């Protein structure tokens, strides 16, 4: 062919997999090649809406556009076409609720984010009425505003027309995964996975089914609820208009469970912790649903060909969001800065901005800084912020120890920081494993899709393939350690007390 005589072109590669990671504060799309390597990434923020202190909302059209654009972006940066994608995986910030019209797909309201605290009062009504018991028992969760069920009650009760249209069978409820699936397939598929369903307060974690009593209690019509599947299942096929190709959606799991999968935490006792705006630690607990006595959540780690693997989770609401406060709020300014702090000074930050999660579950606790001195500056605030990440992880793990009887795996952008992870090993007095790919949440769901599509290896292969970048080891003087640990316990008490 004239003139391809001296013309160079690259062909193909095979086994490409697209993971969409619809996060709290941005959306990412990653293409993984047939070697499970990252080929191309799109990333894009969307607006955080705060209509009142403690209230948090996303525009779901904006989240939608962010998925469309981020996808196109990763594919182009990958040097391929949408037609080269064997399959898609979806993960998502959990608990976040969207309600939308089953016919037009128009949401009736902004998405109410997992961070949102607006139903505190309604959760108190239910608690006083003797109700937390069945929820805890059925669900593994608590009657806190964190979960979906309470937020969905709020939309049905406060958006005009909502309760009515819902009862007619005209509205769809979804966590963010269901919202994406619905839109990717152009309305064809109305579904979630067991892990996202776990998080709603509506689902029975033992029966693997929407729970009649809980839905009745919250006055949610069973109709509005999507079908619940395994994490690797058939979630439909991409609407061909969106990317110019029909791609099967084959992997879906909540972001913290996707990271759990991506860190190969498949066996009982294995544990991971993801560091983002919040921090979320999950312990693989095997076939058994461990009921915590130490203020942890019981949840579904994943459900795989009909089989549910369970987990214990600690959920820290403010982790990275603290340094984000330092940098954008106070603008007082990060491990670089933090290593420069005066050791003589003892400053603690308890970032209880709108309450405290595990293991405290104190929705009335507020932000507090301690131990300031006439000289304390940015450096020490910055240290207090990163150390608060450490100390809260610690308290999660100590609670896990009391619930269960094996080296901490760690991911999220925050951990590329050698100073922070070293400081983490120290305070834990335990070793810390940091992987080669930190985007563990994307890979976990990319694996689930890959493995079902058959272009990627099975569970045990993927598991032994887990690649360590770095084991951190504790190298802090014990005396020093005692001092740091005692100062934090005293910061905590001062923050929790009436």
Q: What angle do CA 284, 401, 200 make, to 5 degrees?
A: 50
**Footprint (CB under 8 A) of a copy of itself, residues 318-357:** 318, 321, 324-325, 329-332, 344, 346, 351, 353-354
Dist. CA 446–CA 440, nearest whole Å: 9
Picked from a copy of itself, Na ion, none, the partner binding residue 241 (CB below 5 to 8 A depending on kind) is: none
Picked from a copy of itself, Na ion, none, the partner binding residue 310 (CB below 5 to 8 A depending on kind) is: none
Minimum distance between the CB of residue 54 and a copy of itself, rounded to whole angstroms?
9
Name the residue nearer to Na ion (CB basis): 79 or 240.
79
Tell me the two tokens of residue 10: 């690259």
Minimum distance between the CB of residue 10 and Na ion, rounded to whole angstroms?
4
Q: How many residues bind a copy of itself (CB under 8 A)?
A: 36
Dist. CA 127–CA 136, nearest whole Å: 11
Picked from Na ion, a copy of itself, none, the partner binding residue 371 (CB below 5 to 8 A depending on kind) is: a copy of itself
- Does 95 carry a binding-site annotation? yes
| Count of CB atoms situated within 10 Å of the CB of 362 | 13
Dist. CA 378–CA 356, nearest whole Å: 24
Interacting span for a copy of itself (CB under 8 A) from 43-51, 103-111, 212-220, 467-475? 43-51
| Count of CB atoms situated within 10 Å of the CB of 108 | 18
Tell me the two tokens of residue 396: 């999660």
- Does 324 carry a binding-site annotation? yes
Picked from a copy of itself, Na ion, none, the partner binding residue 10 (CB below 5 to 8 A depending on kind) is: Na ion
- Does 256 carry a binding-site annotation? yes
Q: In terms of DSSP bridges, do strands 85-92 and 16-22 run parallel, antiparallel, or are they unpaired?
A: parallel
Dist. CA 424–CA 57, nearest whole Å: 32
In angstroms, what CA-CA distances link 428 with 104, 344, 398, 449?
Answer: 51, 21, 9, 35
Contacting positions for Na ion (CB under 5 A): 10, 79
**Footprint (CB under 8 A) of a copy of itself, residues 200-229:** none
Interacting span for a copy of itself (CB under 8 A) from 51-59, 72-80, 218-226, 430-438? 51-59
The answer to whether residue 493 forms part of the interface with a copy of itself (CB under 8 A) is yes
Among left, alpha and beta (phi > 0; psi -120 to 50; other), residue 331 is left
Minimum distance between the CB of residue 318 and a copy of itself, rounded to whole angstroms?
7
Minimum distance between the CB of residue 89 and Na ion, rounded to whole angstroms?
21
**Footprint (CB under 8 A) of a copy of itself, residues 381-420:** 381
In angstroms, what CA-CA distances link 282 with 53, 116, 400?
Answer: 29, 22, 9
What are the start-end ranges of the H helices in 120-270?
Answer: 120-128, 132-139, 148-158, 162-167, 176-184, 194-198, 212-218, 240-243, 255-262
Check the CA dihedral 17-18-21-22 and report its sign.
negative
Name the residue nearer to a copy of itself (CB basis): 78 or 354.
354
Minimum distance between the CB of residue 13 and Na ion, rounded to whole angstroms?
5
Residue that has been written with the tokens 């994608």 in this structure: 85
- Does 54 carry a binding-site annotation? no
Q: By beta-carbon distance, which residue lies closest to Na ion?
A: 10
Interface ranges with a copy of itself (CB under 8 A):
48, 50-53, 318, 321, 324-325, 329-332, 344, 346, 351, 353-354, 366-378, 381, 493-495, 497
List the binding residues: 24-26, 28, 94-95, 146, 255-256, 277, 320, 324, 413
């Amino acid at each position: 062919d004239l003139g391809t005589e001296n013309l160079y072109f690259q062909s193909m590669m095979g086994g490409y997999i697209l993971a969409i990671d619809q996060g709290t504060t941005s959306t990412r799309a990653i293409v993984f090649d047939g070697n499970q390597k990252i080929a191309g990434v799109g990333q894009k923020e969307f607006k955080q809406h705060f209509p009142k202190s403690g209230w948090v909302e996303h525009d779901p059209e904006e989240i939608w556009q962010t998925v469309v654009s981020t996808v196109k972006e990763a594919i182009e940066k990958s040097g391929i076409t949408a037609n080269d994608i064997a399959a898609i995986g979806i993960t998502n910030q959990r608990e976040t609720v969207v309600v939308w019209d089953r016919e037009t797909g128009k949401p009736i309201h902004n998405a109410i984010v997992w961070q949102d605290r607006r139903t505190a009062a309604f959760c108190d009504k239910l608690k006083k009425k003797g109700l937390e018991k069945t929820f805890v028992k059925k669900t593994g969760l608590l009657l806190d505003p964190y979960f979906s069920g309470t937020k969905l009650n709020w939309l049905l009760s406060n958006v005009k027309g909502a309760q009515v249209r819902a009862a007619k069978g005209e509205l769809c409820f979804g966590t963010i995964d269901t919202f994406l699936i619905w839109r990717l397939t152009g309305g064809e598929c109305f579904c979630t996975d067991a892990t996202n369903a776990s998080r709603t307060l509506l689902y029975n974690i033992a029966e693997n089914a929407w729970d009649d009593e809980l839905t009745e209690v919250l006055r949610v019509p069973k109709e509005m609820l999507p079908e619940v599947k395994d994490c690797a299942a058939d979630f439909g096929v991409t609407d061909p208009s969106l990317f110019g190709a029909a791609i099967p959606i084959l992997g879906v799991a909540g972001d913290q469970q996707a990271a759990t999968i991506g860190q190969a935490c498949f066996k009982p006792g294995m544990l991971k912790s993801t560091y983002g705006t919040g921090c979320f630690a999950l312990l693989n607990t095997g076939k058994d649903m461990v009921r915590s006595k130490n203020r942890l959540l019981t949840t579904i780690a994943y459900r795989l060909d009909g089989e549910t693997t369970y987990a214990l989770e600690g959920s820290i609401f403010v982790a990275g969001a603290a340094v984000q406060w330092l940098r954008d709020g106070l603008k007082v300014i990060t491990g670089s800065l933090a290593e420069s702090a005066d050791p003589s000074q003892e400053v603690y930050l308890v970032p209880a901005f709108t309450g405290l999660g595990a293991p405290h579950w104190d929705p009335d606790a507020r932000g507090a800084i301690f131990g300031m001195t006439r000289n304390t500056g940015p450096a020490e605030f910055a240290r207090a912020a990163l150390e608060a990440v450490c100390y809260q992880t610690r308290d999660l793990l100590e609670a896990m120890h009391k619930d269960w009887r094996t080296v901490l795996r760690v991911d999220g952008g925050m951990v590329a920081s050698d100073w922070t992870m070293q400081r983490l090993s120290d305070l834990l007095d335990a070793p810390v494993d940091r992987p080669v790919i930190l985007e563990t949440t994307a890979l976990g769901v990319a694996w689930l899709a890959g493995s079902r599509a058959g272009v990627w290896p099975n569970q045990e292969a993927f598991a032994k393939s887990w690649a360590r970048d770095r084991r951190f080891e504790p190298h802090m003087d014990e005396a020093t350690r005692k001092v740091k640990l005692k100062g934090w316990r005293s910061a905590v008490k001062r923050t929790l007390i009436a």
